[PDB]
Amino acid sequence: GKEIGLQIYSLSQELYKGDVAANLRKVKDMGYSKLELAGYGKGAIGGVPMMDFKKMAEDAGLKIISSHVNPVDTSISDPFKAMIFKYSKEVTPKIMEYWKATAADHAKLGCKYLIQPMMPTITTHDEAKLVCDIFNQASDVIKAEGIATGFGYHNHNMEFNRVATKEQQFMKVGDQIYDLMLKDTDPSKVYFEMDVYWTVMGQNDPVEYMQKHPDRIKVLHIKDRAVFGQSGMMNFEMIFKQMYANGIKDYFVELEQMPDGRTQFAGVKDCADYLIKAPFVK
Numbered sequence: 694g695k696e697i698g699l700q701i702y703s704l705s706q707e708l709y710k711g712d713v714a715a716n717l718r719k720v721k722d723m724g725y726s727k728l729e730l731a732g733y734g735k736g737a738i739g740g741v742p743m744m745d746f747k748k749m750a751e752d753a754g755l756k757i758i759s760s761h762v763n764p765v766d767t768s769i770s771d772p773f774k775a776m777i778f779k780y781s782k783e784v785t786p787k788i789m790e791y792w793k794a795t796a797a798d799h800a801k802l803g804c805k806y807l808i809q810p811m812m813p814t815i816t817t818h819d820e821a822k823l824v825c826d827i828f829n830q831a832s833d834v835i836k837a838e839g840i841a842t843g844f845g846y847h848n849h850n851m852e853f854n855r856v857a858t859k860e861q862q863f864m865k866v867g868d869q870i871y872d873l874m875l876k877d878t879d880p881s882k883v884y885f886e887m888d889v890y891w892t893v894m895g896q897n898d899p900v901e902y903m904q905k906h907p908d909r910i911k912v913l914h915i916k917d918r919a920v921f922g923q924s925g926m927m928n929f930e931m932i933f934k935q936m937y938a939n940g941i942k943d944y945f946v947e948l949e950q951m952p953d954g955r956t957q958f959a960g961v962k963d964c965a966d967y968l969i970k971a972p973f974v975k
């Protein structure tokens with residue numbers, strides 16, 4: 694009876710095809726107990742009124758622990774033109790309006806973590822600074838709505854790109870964006886959900902990051918190229934050893950689109966089975 698989390702985006706639209714209640718029961722039957730949401734918007738999760746989704750998840754024996762959300766300008770219908778990527782002093786009020794409404798909803802959902810998973814546009818040290826200030830202020834807004842954990846941040850690999858000046862410009866030149874995020878976000882306000890796969894895809898070591906910043910990395914995404922253990926990438930034994938040494942209490946399984954024609958439900962099962970059989974996973 695291991696406790697295992699799932700980032701539901703792993704299932705894509707398979708979660709919403711047919712009988713959603715039965716699909717959530719299948720999630721439980723595969724060995725998952727904890728959910729991180731994706732697809733929240735305007736009081737709904739993947740189009741399902743959020744409290745109805747919560748009830749179906751809970752009736753299946755699942756608990757909603759976390760949610761992935763990205764700031765959007767609700768004046769825009771097109772959900773791609775609505776995504777706020779270019780941070781500025783001017784758009785900050787709109788960003789804070791998003792966080793207030795979203796955090797209020799997630800407090801009603803009883804969600805422990807509220808996490809931004811996509812990087813804003815960052816090409817310079819100054820842009821990174823402003824993004825950090827915005828994250829710090831977002832945390833204040835989120836806590837005021839009742840989510841004590843504040844602002845969480847999930848990375849891909851773009852955060853390991855370096856910002857280097859012209860005079861600054863294999864050799865390392867300039868600072869990695871992620872290092873600037875750690876440095877210039879307030880540890881009492883902002884924490885990190887480290888995606889171990891995308892860290893490796895950014896040429897960095899998630900174990901080293903956990904050792905260096907045990908105070909900042911509080912949640913993990915456990916992810917491989919596809920099904921856990923089938924690639925030459927990822928040392929999950931060391932990743933879990935380090936996770937436990939650090940006292941990290943929450944992780945979520947993630948699976949991107951299967952490359953081999955299989956369904957997401959099939960691959961998600963195989964990921965659970967890997968963890969269930971792994972002696973290093975408690």
Ligand SMILES: [Mg+2]
Nearest residue numbers: 888914916947
């Ligand atoms: Mg991830």
